């Protein structure tokens, strides 16, 4: 047999291929990614638990007829919530007048990402706590809520970008620093009987 | 005070717990915990979560749509609506299994994927 049948699967979508044993696996990888509407490089492919490369052949790998290749989504970066909270806690105490624009831009992103980890129903408390942290008054409530609300729903990253272009540095610094302090102390869901249920799970 | 930090502490503790004898009220609360934590992932991460969950559990293709739907509907949930329906509709073993798999895979998966986001935040690690 100069040919081999192989299945590529990601657990949901599976595809039954046939190729020649001396042909690189690239074309199968490309056809599978294409069917998920993805770029080949957004996926990785494993055989017998081992990542394999597009230039390798079923022959080099001692594949057997009807063997299975697993398609796995790439894990790009390691930004767990745990890691984001470490970053926030580190920067919360820092004087930001010092830092490069590149770090400030990234901190803006951190505030936007972390804002989106609060339920909608907490944005009011987040606003009110922001005001009390800064010593601002009800005069500013609408403007602060609108920032948080717009970040919370900022799907394109477009509002975040506008904030970076339109706000002066001192204003950005004041807001970012306010947020990083209050965000770690405020509950991420509102009260309810169901959320009180979580109390029974505390160690 | 269910802070982000406290949410993760609860999840970390319960990922290590044997649920053989789990009480109904505790199971109900674990469902809430999983629903809340699911919503800390960006929508773009749901596919990776589902994929990891299928593989962790040895679930077939036949069950892929179903596990994904649960993830999508927890993620888009409002006022505990879908969560409450899951509690009523699913048998106890199925819920336990789902919750136990979630807690064992969720804590190592990034909560954001965007190239824009990962690139930016890299610079901020101590």
Numbering used by the authors:
A (entry chain B): -77 to 125
B (entry chain A): 0 to 125
Text taken from the publication that reported this structure:
Here, we present the crystal structure of the VP30 CTD from Reston ebolavirus. The two copies of RESTV VP30 in the asymmetric unit are nearly identical in structure and superimpose with an r.m.s.d. of 0.76 Å. One of the Smt domains helps facilitate crystal-packing interactions, whereas the second Smt domain is disordered. The fold of RESTV VP30 CTD is helical and closely resembles that of EBOV VP30, with an r.m.s.d. of 1.15–2.14 Å separating the Cα backbones of the EBOV and RESTV structures. Reston VP30 and Ebola VP30 both form homodimers, but the dimeric interfaces are rotated relative to each other, suggesting subtle inherent differences or flexibility in the dimeric interface. Dimerization in both EBOV and RESTV VP30 is also facilitated by similar hydrophobic interactions between the globular domains and a conserved hydrogen bond between the side chain of Lys180 in helix 2 and the main chain of Cys251 in the linker between helices 6 and 7. The domain rotation lowers the buried surface area on each monomer (RESTV, 1630 Å2; EBOV, 1900 Å2) but maintains a similar surface complementarity (RESTV, SC = 0.69; EBOV, SC = 0.68), suggesting that the RESTV VP30 CTD dimer is a relevant conformation, and conservation of residues within the dimer interface suggests this conformation could also exist for EBOV. Additionally, the Smt domain in the RESTV VP30 CTD structure contributes to the crystal packing as well as making contacts with the opposite chain in the asymmetric unit (buries 545 Å2). The occlusion of Arg179 and Lys180 in the RESTV dimer interface suggests that mutations at these positions could disrupt VP30 dimerization. While we are unable to rule out the influence of the Smt on the conformation of the RESTV dimer, the observation of two dimer conformations in the available structures suggests that there may be inherent differences between the African and Asian viral species.
